[PDB]
Amino acid sequence: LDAELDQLLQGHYIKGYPKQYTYFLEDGKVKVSRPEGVKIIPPQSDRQKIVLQAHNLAHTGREATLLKIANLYWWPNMRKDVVKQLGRCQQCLITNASNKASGPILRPDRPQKPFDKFFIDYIGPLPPSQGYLYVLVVVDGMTGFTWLYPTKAPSTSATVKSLNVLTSIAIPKVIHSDQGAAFTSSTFAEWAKERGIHLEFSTPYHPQSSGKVERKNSDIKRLLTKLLVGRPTKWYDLLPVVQLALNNTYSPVLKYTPHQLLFGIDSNTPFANQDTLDLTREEELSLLQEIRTSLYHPSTPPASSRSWSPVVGQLVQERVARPASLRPRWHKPSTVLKVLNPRTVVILDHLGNNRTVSIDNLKPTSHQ
Amino acid sequence: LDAELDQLLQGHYIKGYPKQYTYFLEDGKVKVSRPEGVKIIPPQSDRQKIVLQAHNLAHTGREATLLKIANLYWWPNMRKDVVKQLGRCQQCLITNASNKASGPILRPDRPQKPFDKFFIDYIGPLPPSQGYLYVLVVVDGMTGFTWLYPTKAPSTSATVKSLNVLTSIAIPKVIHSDQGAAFTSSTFAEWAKERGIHLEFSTPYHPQSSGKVERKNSDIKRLLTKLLVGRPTKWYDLLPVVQLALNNTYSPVLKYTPHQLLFGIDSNTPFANQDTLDLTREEELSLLQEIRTSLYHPSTPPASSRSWSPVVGQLVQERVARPASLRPRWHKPSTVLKVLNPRTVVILDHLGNNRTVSIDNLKPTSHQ
Amino acid sequence: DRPQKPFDKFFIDYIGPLPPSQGYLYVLVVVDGMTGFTWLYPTKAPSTSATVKSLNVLTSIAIPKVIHSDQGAAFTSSTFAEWAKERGIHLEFSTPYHPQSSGKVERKNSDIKRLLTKLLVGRPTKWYDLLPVVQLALNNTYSPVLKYTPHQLLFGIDSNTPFANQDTLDLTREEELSLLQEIR
Amino acid sequence: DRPQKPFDKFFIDYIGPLPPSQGYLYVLVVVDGMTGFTWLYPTKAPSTSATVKSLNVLTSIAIPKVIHSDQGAAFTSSTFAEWAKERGIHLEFSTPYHPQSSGKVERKNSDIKRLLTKLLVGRPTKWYDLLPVVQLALNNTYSPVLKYTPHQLLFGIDSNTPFANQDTLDLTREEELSLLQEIR
DNA sequence: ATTGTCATGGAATTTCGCA
DNA sequence: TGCGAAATTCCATGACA
DNA sequence: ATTGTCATGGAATTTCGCA
DNA sequence: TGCGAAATTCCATGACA
Ligand SMILES: O=C1c2c(c3n(c(=O)c2O)[C@]2(CC[C@@H]4C[C@@H]42)N(CCN2C(=O)C=CC2=O)C3=O)CCN1Cc1ccc(F)c(Cl)c1
Ligand SMILES: O=C1c2c(c3n(c(=O)c2O)[C@]2(CC[C@@H]4C[C@@H]42)N(CCN2C(=O)C=CC2=O)C3=O)CCN1Cc1ccc(F)c(Cl)c1
Ligand SMILES: [Mg+2]
Ligand SMILES: [Mg+2]
Ligand SMILES: [Mg+2]
Ligand SMILES: [Mg+2]
Ligand SMILES: [Mg+2]
Ligand SMILES: [Mg+2]
Ligand SMILES: [Zn+2]
Ligand SMILES: [Zn+2]
């Protein structure tokens, strides 16, 4: 834009160029005496190359790119031009970290009845004990009642074998699990359809979704650790002891044990609660139905000062799962198809695939 | 204490036992009709065994152990007895997690002059490039100026070879590093004594102490990642490009590049700042001395609501470095010998060894 | 006297020898006295070790105050007595040759022996895999005397597998001839 | 006219062939025109590739606006001209057989040639390891004309290694006889 | 086509025992 | 109708690799 | 015998250009 | 003496594995 700069040198006003400054010609280039010093005003036709050259030195963000440019040049709304470049640098978009936190977590309603929802997951590999390396953890959502099964691998075969023993007691409406090879298999889907069990899956690489079982994994390990202090790690024989120990342990916030929430009566275990001895099983089952409904339910916490929530059509980027050494931590921009809830979203990547992801594994693409 | 319980059955008042309750005998055991129900009052001589039996079911904390006990018994100040037991369970003390956060971080003063303090660390293993796997990162504390050296291992030999090339420019007062094999060696101590360089070491397993270099490690990798997008990871030839790129990059908060803080003048690099062209090198060096002193210094952040700060004589526990599967995450209690600063401490473990640790790798032993 | 509750009394007994299925020959039958809930464990023998191996699984879910059985060798052994003593379980025995349990239990054990027999005919070597379906059938079987099924009495909720189809349990003339053909 | 600054002009030249030390035979000498700061790189030849390999290390710390050298083959080559063009470095040459630099620089290059000679005598094969100490010596050497050392002029601070001991630099009668013994 | 959870032990707050 | 202490509740902290 | 750091891009706040 | 917009400053967020 040498035409735009011509009128400037003459002396007549152009939108963006402050009138109170002296625009002169020197060394065959339009200059301006600014408070900071004399800066070259490059023609609009040159500014993109300049912004790009400055940015490409260390692939710097807004201010660091501006501070370089400002050493030599001046032009109206420089940062608008810096930001246009940042938003078009594929390398910056896929390598840089987010600076916007996810919206506050959801506290899904507790399943209403026992056997409405199970949460399943594997712990392991653990030190080999009796040829076993893994533990299948099954947590009833409503009660917290846990069933532990030692396995030789986190396989479909071992899950099916174990779940066939569990399901002899009662059959669940839904089985929630993560996207582990063992649960996403066709053989497992077949095993569940065959029984009227609905398989629900967590968003990928988001274990907080399986929070219920994950949290119980912590207790199982903490207790095994304690019981194995100063002894070899022979956990296989402890699984039943741990299962019974935990299923009969008070949750200080509920003032109930998973056993009590499942049966409404302690069995012949130490310190069994005697409070309903004079009640009939019906009077007892009535009180249990009342306890199950009145349990404490946590509320969503306050959103952090700089949180972001998904919007349909928003350009968002998925986190690379197992990023190789010296490779980007982010995927290329994607479009938000549907906002399932404020923490779960459906995205369409560049390939054309529909993915249901957690906002924890997303960042909103910067500079729009 | 059957003598203590005798006077009770008779009807005369005992300190701790509320007078308004009816203390009777049934099935050869002292009972009490309490609002919750009829509970057995065991003799003081039995309470320790009871508390221990309840606790040992799932090695539960205060409330969960109390809720079990309270199902069968009642005695004055039950929790005082529960807490005495918790504080004596070695398994609980070494396995349980802390619930008290560290005090707020210190923001050590920026070294006054360049070469007063260097921060050194290794990045790697990286994808092999020209037989090289690691990068030796040397950050001047005052300026942030970085020197990168490709190595075949994080060895003393490679550090010495590299540092002999660096020290041809200037010799530093102190070299701060972590406790990596390469820096804690006798050969390295010898190399530094030989030069009047004082070796300073970070508390073990606390990379925030080497914060200055660690943070620069992030930039080096972020830039290498960007420059290697869609190309094989041939980083060896990029080290000089990256070094120059970063040393000449603006720190938005300082409004200076590490090069400018080291020399007070940009070299023949793109967008070199021309602001001191008419100044003499002396006028320029004078302004540089003024810039170096007026740089922004961050302040310690507010302490979290539930933070803990070390006290001499306090029973504290060190974190196990590489805890084996199903093994405790904590060491046995230790005594705080000296509080070096509110974030660094000297401890004496059970062995009789003096260790300078970070409070981040400590937890205050619960129940005193 | 305090009302009947679950885990007050478990009635245990062995069914078999049955035709071998997955190496198994017996079924240990555990019936909760109050609810009538049934747990079936396949064993390879009616021994104390097989009883202890099986009951160790059950007693990891809930411990009964009393175990009731006949004077079978596996239950009268000092090993079984030591196992129960360790768990605070009182052992109880019926008089030899006079097996008394309870109306509900006697009736339940009858349904078990008959339901097993019904499904054995045709597939006498496939019963190992059927134990979970047999158990769900038995536990979602309406009690005419109590108005509720053993699943309802134990959990205090309806089951996701209601067994509304009240089957024959009595062998068909075709199953009778097929059953008398196996006995050869 | 604008005052003299560091990185305005680097004066480069080769010292050697020297007795082989760690396979190296030459020293490329870089002297900043303004501060008089010296950088010494050992090469195996006075070639363009060895000059480019060495200067690529230096130009990763700071880039001079101008490089000044004599008409040596390594500096007059089109490869060296392409390298400098890429870095925006202007090349400058002294007239053949008439090597002009600057007073400060001519004097510095003299101290370099003499300091090297002084330490070569006795250990002519150990100079590779000495280049860092030689460099620190040279850069913490007080300038009578400027009042400051090249370390002070470049960094604007005192050095942690002040070379207060102003050594002879002139060979002792013992070093003279030992030097004339090597030349055999 | 889904979604965090909850034991833990000091601190804060409520309740108890007595008057 | 209010005190001091015990009991209960709150809730940040950290780990499920 | 020691100790976090700082690029990043929206938001908040200050400054600029003009009157 | 005050407006609207641009420039600057602030600062939470996350990663140095
Ligand atoms: O529980 C898990 C966990 C984890 C993983 N996986 C699980 O199944 C699983 O249950 C799988 C295994 C296969 C399947 C796809 C899933 N992978 C992929 C393969 N892989 C690696 O990439 C590294 C280890 C590993 O197995 C996980 O990384 C890691 C987090 N943790 C602990 C945790 C951390 C933070 C939290 F907040 C919570 Cl609540 C829990
Ligand atoms: O920088 C490091 C880092 C780390 C380690 N080490 C370093 O030298 C080092 O520099 C050594 C190596 C040997 C020496 C004893 C130290 N080990 C022990 C052996 N080892 C493992 O136990 C696991 C990997 C590994 O090398 C570290 O774990 C991990 C954290 N990071 C990244 C980081 C994380 C969080 C932060 F907040 C900051 Cl600022 C930085
Ligand atoms: Mg999993
Ligand atoms: Mg998991
Ligand atoms: Mg390190
Ligand atoms: Mg490091
Ligand atoms: Mg019998
Ligand atoms: Mg010459
Ligand atoms: Zn970029
Ligand atoms: Zn314990």
Side-chain angles (χ1 to χ4, degrees), chain A residues 2-14 16-35 37-79 81-83 85-321 323-337 339-368, chain B residues 2-14 16-35 37-79 81-83 85-321 323-337 339-368, chain C residues 1 3-52 54-81 83-105 107-112 114-125 127-165 167-176 178 180 182-183, chain D residues 1 3-52 54-81 83-105 107-112 114-125 127-165 167-176 178 180 182-183:
Chain A
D2 194 69
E4 170 193 54
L5 298 178
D6 244 294
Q7 284 83 256
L8 198 76
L9 294 147
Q10 282 164 24
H12 234 343
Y13 180 75
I14 295 118
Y17 297 84
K19 230 275 174 181
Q20 59 176 94
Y21 289 101
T22 39
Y23 305 92
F24 65 102
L25 205 129
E26 192 172 280
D27 299 287
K29 35 179 99 200
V30 186
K31 297 196 179 183
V32 65
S33 187
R34 282 201 74 83
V38 183
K39 314 281 170 179
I40 291 150
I41 305 179
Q44 179 53 49
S45 62
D46 275 353
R47 298 170 193 177
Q48 170 168 326
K49 200 199 190 200
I50 285 144
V51 178
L52 186 65
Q53 276 175 1
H55 171 89
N56 284 352
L57 301 161
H59 278 264
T60 52
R62 191 220 319 145
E63 296 307 305
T65 305
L66 177 114
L67 286 148
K68 276 275 151 180
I69 304 171
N71 279 351
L72 301 186
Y73 315 99
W74 184 86
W75 73 80
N77 319 305
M78 257 153 122
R79 284 169 176 91
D81 288 307
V82 171
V83 174
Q85 269 308 302
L86 309 174
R88 306 216 175 106
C89 181
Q90 215 58 23
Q91 291 108 298
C92 282
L93 308 160
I94 63 179
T95 310
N96 289 354
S98 185
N99 66 338
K100 319 286 170 233
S102 291
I105 60 155
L106 288 168
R107 297 315 311 263
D109 280 314
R110 178 181 294 276
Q112 267 174 53
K113 291 176 278 178
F115 310 104
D116 280 353
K117 204 181 280 191
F118 275 4
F119 285 85
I120 67 166
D121 197 44
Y122 273 102
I123 280 162
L126 291 189
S129 184
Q130 306 261 296
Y132 293 93
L133 296 130
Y134 296 80
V135 175
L136 172 77
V137 182
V138 184
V139 186
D140 178 63
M142 192 279 128
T143 65
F145 205 91
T146 302
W147 286 268
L148 310 168
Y149 304 91
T151 83
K152 289 175 184 174
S155 60
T156 298
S157 55
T159 308
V160 168
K161 280 176 185 167
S162 303
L163 285 174
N164 282 336
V165 172
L166 180 27
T167 69
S168 304
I169 300 330
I171 287 204
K173 284 165 164 91
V174 175
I175 284 178
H176 182 118
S177 78
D178 54 31
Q179 298 181 21
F183 316 130
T184 57
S185 79
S186 10
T187 320
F188 193 65
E190 156 199 289
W191 173 88
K193 191 198 187 83
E194 200 160 287
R195 282 153 183 82
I197 301 176
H198 175 250
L199 298 192
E200 191 169 76
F201 295 95
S202 271
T203 49
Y205 307 98
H206 194 254
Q208 296 96 296
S209 291
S210 286
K212 263 246 145 68
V213 59
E214 288 312 348
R215 184 51 168 85
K216 185 72 66 165
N217 284 353
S218 186
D219 297 328
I220 294 154
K221 288 189 135 179
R222 179 156 64 96
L223 183 55
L224 282 166
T225 295
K226 291 178 187 179
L227 298 178
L228 294 160
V229 163
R231 291 183 171 88
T233 63
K234 307 186 174 196
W235 56 268
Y236 180 86
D237 289 332
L238 293 180
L239 284 196
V241 178
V242 171
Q243 188 188 269
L244 182 81
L246 296 184
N247 286 335
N248 288 275
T249 287
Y250 278 94
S251 164
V253 70
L254 314 174
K255 305 211 251 136
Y256 296 106
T257 74
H259 184 269
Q260 291 161 348
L261 301 168
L262 185 54
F263 308 107
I265 181 163
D266 279 330
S267 68
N268 180 35
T269 61
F271 303 85
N273 178 266
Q274 285 175 286
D275 293 359
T276 59
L277 262 175
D278 300 310
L279 290 189
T280 62
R281 181 57 175 165
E282 244 172 68
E283 296 178 298
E284 200 171 75
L285 279 187
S286 189
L287 173 73
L288 169 67
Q289 297 179 104
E290 176 51 32
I291 281 155
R292 284 170 171 166
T293 62
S294 72
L295 301 173
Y296 159 79
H297 199 78
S299 52
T300 61
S304 67
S305 5
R306 296 194 191 172
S307 56
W308 78 279
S309 286
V311 149
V312 179
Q314 181 168 34
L315 221 49
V316 120
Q317 303 173 234
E318 209 193 335
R319 192 198 304 276
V320 172
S325 185
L326 304 182
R327 289 298 186 203
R329 270 45 187 161
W330 305 92
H331 282 306
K332 280 158 194 194
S334 288
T335 337
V336 170
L337 298 183
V339 171
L340 297 187
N341 61 45
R343 304 263 317 147
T344 331
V345 108
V346 184
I347 58 137
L348 170 67
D349 45 45
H350 67 305
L351 299 325
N353 288 276
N354 267 39
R355 290 175 61 50
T356 306
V357 293
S358 175
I359 70 160
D360 281 354
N361 292 325
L362 291 183
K363 68 145 153 170
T365 304
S366 292
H367 328 289
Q368 303 158 326
Chain B
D2 194 69
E4 170 193 54
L5 298 178
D6 244 294
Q7 284 83 256
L8 198 76
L9 294 147
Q10 282 164 24
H12 234 343
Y13 180 75
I14 295 118
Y17 297 84
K19 230 275 174 181
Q20 59 176 94
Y21 289 101
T22 39
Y23 305 92
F24 65 102
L25 205 129
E26 192 172 280
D27 299 287
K29 35 179 99 200
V30 186
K31 297 196 179 183
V32 65
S33 187
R34 282 201 74 83
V38 183
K39 314 281 170 179
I40 291 150
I41 305 179
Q44 179 53 49
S45 62
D46 275 353
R47 298 170 193 177
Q48 170 168 326
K49 200 199 190 200
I50 285 144
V51 178
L52 186 65
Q53 276 175 1
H55 171 89
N56 284 352
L57 301 161
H59 278 264
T60 52
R62 191 220 319 145
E63 296 307 305
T65 305
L66 177 114
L67 286 148
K68 276 275 151 180
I69 304 171
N71 279 351
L72 301 186
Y73 315 99
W74 184 86
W75 73 80
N77 319 305
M78 257 153 122
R79 284 169 176 91
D81 288 307
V82 171
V83 174
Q85 269 308 302
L86 309 174
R88 306 216 175 106
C89 181
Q90 215 58 23
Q91 291 108 298
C92 282
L93 308 160
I94 63 179
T95 310
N96 289 354
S98 185
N99 66 338
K100 319 286 170 233
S102 291
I105 60 155
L106 288 168
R107 297 315 311 263
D109 280 314
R110 178 181 294 276
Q112 267 174 53
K113 291 176 278 178
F115 310 104
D116 280 353
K117 204 181 280 191
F118 275 4
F119 285 85
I120 67 166
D121 197 44
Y122 273 102
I123 280 162
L126 291 189
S129 184
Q130 306 261 296
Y132 293 93
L133 296 130
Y134 296 80
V135 175
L136 172 77
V137 182
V138 184
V139 186
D140 178 63
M142 192 279 128
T143 65
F145 205 91
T146 302
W147 286 268
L148 310 168
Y149 304 91
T151 83
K152 289 175 184 174
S155 60
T156 298
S157 55
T159 308
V160 168
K161 280 176 185 167
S162 303
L163 285 174
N164 282 336
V165 172
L166 180 27
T167 69
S168 304
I169 300 330
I171 287 204
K173 284 165 164 91
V174 175
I175 284 178
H176 182 118
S177 78
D178 54 31
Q179 298 181 21
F183 316 130
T184 57
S185 79
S186 10
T187 320
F188 193 65
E190 156 199 289
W191 173 88
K193 191 198 187 83
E194 200 160 287
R195 282 153 183 82
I197 301 176
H198 175 250
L199 298 192
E200 191 169 76
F201 295 95
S202 271
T203 49
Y205 307 98
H206 194 254
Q208 296 96 296
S209 291
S210 286
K212 263 246 145 68
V213 59
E214 288 312 348
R215 184 51 168 85
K216 185 72 66 165
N217 284 353
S218 186
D219 297 328
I220 294 154
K221 288 189 135 179
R222 179 156 64 96
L223 183 55
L224 282 166
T225 295
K226 291 178 187 179
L227 298 178
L228 294 160
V229 163
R231 291 183 171 88
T233 63
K234 307 186 174 196
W235 56 268
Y236 180 86
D237 289 332
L238 293 180
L239 284 196
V241 178
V242 171
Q243 188 188 269
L244 182 81
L246 296 184
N247 286 335
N248 288 275
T249 287
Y250 278 94
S251 164
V253 70
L254 314 174
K255 305 211 251 136
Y256 296 106
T257 74
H259 184 269
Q260 291 161 348
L261 301 168
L262 185 54
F263 308 107
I265 181 163
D266 279 330
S267 68
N268 180 35
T269 61
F271 303 85
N273 178 266
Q274 285 175 286
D275 293 359
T276 59
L277 262 175
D278 300 310
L279 290 189
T280 62
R281 181 57 175 165
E282 244 172 68
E283 296 178 298
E284 200 171 75
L285 279 187
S286 189
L287 173 73
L288 169 67
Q289 297 179 104
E290 176 51 32
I291 281 155
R292 284 170 171 166
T293 62
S294 72
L295 301 173
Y296 159 79
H297 199 78
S299 52
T300 61
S304 67
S305 5
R306 296 194 191 172
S307 56
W308 78 279
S309 286
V311 149
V312 179
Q314 181 168 34
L315 221 49
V316 120
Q317 303 173 234
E318 209 193 335
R319 192 198 304 276
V320 172
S325 185
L326 304 182
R327 289 298 186 203
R329 270 45 187 161
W330 305 92
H331 282 306
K332 280 158 194 194
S334 288
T335 337
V336 170
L337 298 183
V339 171
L340 297 187
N341 61 45
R343 304 263 317 147
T344 331
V345 108
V346 184
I347 58 137
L348 170 67
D349 45 45
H350 67 305
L351 299 325
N353 288 276
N354 267 39
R355 290 175 61 50
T356 306
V357 293
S358 175
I359 70 160
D360 281 354
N361 292 325
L362 291 183
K363 68 145 153 170
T365 304
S366 292
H367 328 289
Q368 303 158 326
Chain C
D1 215 19
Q4 242 196 304
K5 292 292 171 53
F7 321 124
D8 271 354
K9 197 166 282 186
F10 278 6
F11 291 84
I12 72 159
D13 203 16
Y14 270 106
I15 275 173
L18 298 171
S21 176
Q22 312 257 55
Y24 293 92
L25 292 116
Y26 293 85
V27 171
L28 172 67
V29 173
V30 187
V31 172
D32 169 66
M34 191 275 155
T35 78
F37 201 89
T38 305
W39 288 272
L40 311 164
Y41 302 98
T43 68
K44 283 154 166 154
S47 59
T48 303
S49 98
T51 301
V52 165
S54 287
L55 293 180
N56 270 334
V57 177
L58 180 50
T59 54
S60 293
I61 311 294
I63 302 171
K65 292 193 181 134
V66 172
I67 282 174
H68 177 110
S69 54
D70 55 28
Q71 308 250 344
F75 322 127
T76 50
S77 74
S78 62
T79 305
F80 193 67
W83 177 88
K85 199 167 194 164
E86 283 166 27
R87 281 138 191 87
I89 298 169
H90 169 246
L91 291 190
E92 182 178 283
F93 299 102
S94 65
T95 292
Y97 315 101
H98 311 100
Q100 59 89 49
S101 54
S102 96
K104 184 169 180 55
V105 174
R107 276 176 244 125
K108 186 55 74 176
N109 263 274
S110 159
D111 300 0
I112 304 155
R114 288 172 69 212
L115 179 56
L116 274 172
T117 299
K118 176 96 181 159
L119 305 177
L120 268 167
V121 169
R123 48 202 161 163
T125 189
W127 60 264
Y128 179 91
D129 314 278
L130 292 160
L131 298 180
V133 69
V134 170
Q135 255 179 266
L136 287 160
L138 295 158
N139 295 311
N140 291 282
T141 280
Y142 162 77
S143 158
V145 83
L146 274 153
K147 189 234 173 284
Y148 300 113
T149 68
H151 179 105
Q152 306 184 301
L153 288 165
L154 191 58
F155 306 118
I157 55 142
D158 282 16
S159 145
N160 307 310
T161 66
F163 284 62
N165 272 312
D167 210 51
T168 58
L169 224 84
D170 294 281
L171 316 141
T172 71
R173 74 103 50 205
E174 233 264 74
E175 280 165 37
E176 282 169 22
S178 301
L180 293 154
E182 287 173 39
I183 313 298
Chain D
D1 215 19
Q4 242 196 304
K5 292 292 171 53
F7 321 124
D8 271 354
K9 197 166 282 186
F10 278 6
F11 291 84
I12 72 159
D13 203 16
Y14 270 106
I15 275 173
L18 298 171
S21 176
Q22 312 257 55
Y24 293 92
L25 292 116
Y26 293 85
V27 171
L28 172 67
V29 173
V30 187
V31 172
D32 169 66
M34 191 275 155
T35 78
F37 201 89
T38 305
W39 288 272
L40 311 164
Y41 302 98
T43 68
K44 283 154 166 154
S47 59
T48 303
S49 98
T51 301
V52 165
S54 287
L55 293 180
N56 270 334
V57 177
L58 180 50
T59 54
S60 293
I61 311 294
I63 302 171
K65 292 193 181 134
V66 172
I67 282 174
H68 177 110
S69 54
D70 55 28
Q71 308 250 344
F75 322 127
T76 50
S77 74
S78 62
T79 305
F80 193 67
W83 177 88
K85 199 167 194 164
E86 283 166 27
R87 281 138 191 87
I89 298 169
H90 169 246
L91 291 190
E92 182 178 283
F93 299 102
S94 65
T95 292
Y97 315 101
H98 311 100
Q100 59 89 49
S101 54
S102 96
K104 184 169 180 55
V105 174
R107 276 176 244 125
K108 186 55 74 176
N109 263 274
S110 159
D111 300 0
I112 304 155
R114 288 172 69 212
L115 179 56
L116 274 172
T117 299
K118 176 96 181 159
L119 305 177
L120 268 167
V121 169
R123 48 202 161 163
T125 189
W127 60 264
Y128 179 91
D129 314 278
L130 292 160
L131 298 180
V133 69
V134 170
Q135 255 179 266
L136 287 160
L138 295 158
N139 295 311
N140 291 282
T141 280
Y142 162 77
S143 158
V145 83
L146 274 153
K147 189 234 173 284
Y148 300 113
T149 68
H151 179 105
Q152 306 184 301
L153 288 165
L154 191 58
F155 306 118
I157 55 142
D158 282 16
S159 145
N160 307 310
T161 66
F163 284 62
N165 272 312
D167 210 51
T168 58
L169 224 84
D170 294 281
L171 316 141
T172 71
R173 74 103 50 205
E174 233 264 74
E175 280 165 37
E176 282 169 22
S178 301
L180 293 154
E182 287 173 39
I183 313 298

